[PDB]
Amino acid sequence: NLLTLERDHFKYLFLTSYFDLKDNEHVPSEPMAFIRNYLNCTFDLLDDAVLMNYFNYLQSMQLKHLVGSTSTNIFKFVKPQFRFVCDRTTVDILEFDTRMYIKPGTPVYATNLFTSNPRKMMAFLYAEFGKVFKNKIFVNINNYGCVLAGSAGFLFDDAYVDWNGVRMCAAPRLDNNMHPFRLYLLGEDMAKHFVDNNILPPHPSNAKTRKINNSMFMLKNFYKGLPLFKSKYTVVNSTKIVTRKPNDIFNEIDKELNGNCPFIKFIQRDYIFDAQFPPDLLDLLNEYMTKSSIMKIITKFVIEENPAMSGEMSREIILDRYSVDNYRKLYIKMEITNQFPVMYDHESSYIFVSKDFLQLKGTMNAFYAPKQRILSILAVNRLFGATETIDFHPNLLVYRQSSPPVRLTGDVYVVDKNEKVFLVKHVFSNTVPAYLLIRGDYESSSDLKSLRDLNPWVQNTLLKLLIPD
Amino acid sequence: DLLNEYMTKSSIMKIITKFVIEENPAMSGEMSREIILDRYSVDNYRKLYIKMEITNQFPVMYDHESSYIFVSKDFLQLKGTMNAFYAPKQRILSILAVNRLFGATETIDFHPNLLVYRQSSPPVRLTGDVYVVDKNEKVFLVKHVFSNTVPAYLLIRGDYESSSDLKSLRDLNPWVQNTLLKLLIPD
Amino acid sequence: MECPFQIQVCISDRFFAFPHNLVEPQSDVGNKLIENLIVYVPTDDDRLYIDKKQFPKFNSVLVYRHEHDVNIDSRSPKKTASATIVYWNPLVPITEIGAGETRVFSVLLTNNLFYCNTMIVHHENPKCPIEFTYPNLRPIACEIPLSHFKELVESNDFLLCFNLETSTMVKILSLKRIFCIFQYRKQPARYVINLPHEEIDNLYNKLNWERTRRLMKGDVPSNCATVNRSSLKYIKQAQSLLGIPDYSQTVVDFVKMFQKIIFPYQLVPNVIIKLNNFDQMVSSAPNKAEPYKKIRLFCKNDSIAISSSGIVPINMPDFSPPNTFDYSDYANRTNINFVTQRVLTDGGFSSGITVTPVKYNYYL
């Protein structure tokens, strides 16, 4: 008899197959052994109809970029599995970052095949392309793969790769693979040919000894491989919440941060946009987590001391949209060893909006308040919680008519000698760095300071806010 | 249906092009899809995309045969004419050097009143080939190309004084010469 | 255009100078080698830069300025076999060909040649010329460089002109060659042009279309180019409203400085947003007013992307009309009005205040 398994375990199958499993303990024993066999890829031992059924199950729990399918062969030959089309990528200013030219709007597919290593094999693919086309001229052959008028082609590239985003800018690496680089294919006619080809590469890397899998290259079915690790959090208490209105979310947040903890940690699991899911599926996801996922620390605009309001540290309290649309507030025992999505060092926290401060329209990190008629800019931190917005207009900038003997202390940066505009350092609660804009008659201990000598973060904000437009 | 899969090499054939004004840069790479159409039926038509090819063979044609330009929807061909047309918004008459018109569905007949004698400025200076059509009527013909690639001749009537280097009708092609011979309609 | 069979095009920036060596005697089928050789050039002056003695392979060598006949125009050119024939940086359509495949070599791809058999032997130029402008002086022989390459090697500031009558295409050719020869220099020399330039902006647009034409088979070079009026004056105003350590600061410095903030703040700078705004077409594009040309931006190993609309899921369109909507219960007009009156009264301000609710994309 072939190995066979129940309908229900599709949950485990997708989980393990698609998100780069590491743990295998918590899967039920028999389904786990069956999935082990599957990843061992000795396909003849398992029923085909099982495969077809699971594919239909995915068609039910339908993903966006699924490639259409008709035959089991997809698990037996190199085939496309996802679908894309070239965005604009129409920008001149920065370097192409080794991102080779592509004709805009060209359709594209990703293969099922991955490698540790370019260049050792791709002559094989070149011979395949030789089969594909007879006459050829001026091929843009390269390390990475076939290039010719864009159009038909192929290349090695990483798994998570965006298509036709304008940058590849530096960010820390995290993952490792035995076969990091999936192949990707260009031009529909080659994919059409591959519908026929039903071909598998020669594998002298394994002495061509009929090996199901190869030391330098490997098929995977729809494996995106996004990071995952088991949740282990020392839960104290839980609550689940179901609503759609962010203002209500904000009211809840305020209610919570009237508790003694200075701050709240918030997370946003990424995959929530991807497709339709069983709630039970989401339950299974709840106990494993992806280090790439969005995360923030946010605090109230701290003012002043309630001396009794202290000693809460033991509670660590967090919330996230465990559901695509619903949330899971949690109290946990305070702990070091629990683990969280990796984020860059020195990352600024966020400050929750104030109930009298209005964020400037189309801006960040700057706002105005009426009761004193004052404009303010955070030196570092990032606004949060605004809902309404207000446009700037120069009329707001009432310069003061005060008597000539004005004086000031600390660094002043002149903004305009003509409009008598200036900026001055300030710290709210002796702790929050900020800058105060001002206009009118004012004076200092001389000691003029130059706009050049300032942070880009504030500088860009100011550069728009001047709106010489 | 049986006949469609054979063909007769004597049969009529043409190529036609749009009056290519300008470049949409993305409009490229289409060559692999060659495009054909003909009335496979006595009265009904077959449109085909085919794989681009060299070795396929097509009805016999003389070398240098003039293909055609599709009509411009703002111009008019001149009645009983070929290669000649006029544009109203600019009030200009025009004659193709070689190519042959296609796609028009109606024509205005020539009439002399169309030929504005622009009073113009007293001094006018012009360059290139010039051929006096009629010194008396101050009529002249001048070389021009559209889009650096579309040879044609421009009629003019008025002061339009030019370099001394008067050229002679003798030199021109019989094609255009016939064309002029009629269009002048000295009759 | 028709591209007649039996032609090949070679692009190479080296073709700014004549590649005497490469040409070889053609022969007709039957090995009918033809030692007659004719070459066509844009101007007689070109003849002043070609040595017969390079070509002992041939007994008969003649040179003429190309001239675009009308009477003999054909999509399918006249044939001949009595001589091998070449054109050198030809500008205008050709009507005659010698025995065997004809070859032609140029730096500039015209639209005429697009649908044609071509090779480029491209290479990456690491260096880029810097545009310069000023309200020491280095007058240069316009249009006629060859007697001056030594000067260009031996200086780093230059100015150039043209005769008033110059054909626009000739101007294009001269400029292209100048830039090409510059790109090999070790020092990004300053250059200026003594022209009203209003049309020259459109000429730069031509250069851009040409660059795309190349890219159809090209090297995806990080070629330097920019809009030079709107962008220019705007950036000048920006520097003026900032501290001006340098009257002559390089344009790219702004972007290079701003690169730091991008990843750590995960948001799009206003500078780059007004870039891709002020271009005629590669922008918000006043030619059409198409702000939906928003940037999508990605970085190494991101699980996300960034745009003018903020964070987005990877490889996704802008936003789903279905949503956890910005439900109108919040941002009801009435509540907006209430808060607006609150603000207006508390401020004691007459007019000029306006407000709007925030909104959200896929992500929130």
Place this chain on the structure above:
Amino acid sequence: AQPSEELINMRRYRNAARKLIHHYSLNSTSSTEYKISDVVMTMIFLLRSEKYHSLFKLLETTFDDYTCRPQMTQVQTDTLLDAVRSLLEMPSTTIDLTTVD
């Protein structure tokens, strides 16, 4: 059915009614201001949006002819004032209760 006559010259109806209203409240400029057919067209043009029907109701109250001043349905009055501003298509130029009265 033939829906023409109700709004066919929406242009006439809108432009003339708005002109008339500007003549009254905005006192705008000298004209041979009159057409009783336009007066009727005012009502018919009102009878094809709620943001009209409200004002139409108020104006109908005048057909009672008594000089009483109607109760301010404060919230609805305010929303109505905003609808008046909109339907007058003015630069929010301080259209006010006093001009309404």
Place this chain on the structure above:
Amino acid sequence: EDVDYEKESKRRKLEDEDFLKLKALEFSKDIVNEK
């Protein structure tokens, strides 16, 4: 095996660095006027 061309392309880059030196020979003054 390294079937790709990048090695020879790097050789082309070397040749490009060599490219300018030849112009001196191509264009310098000349020993004699044979005419």
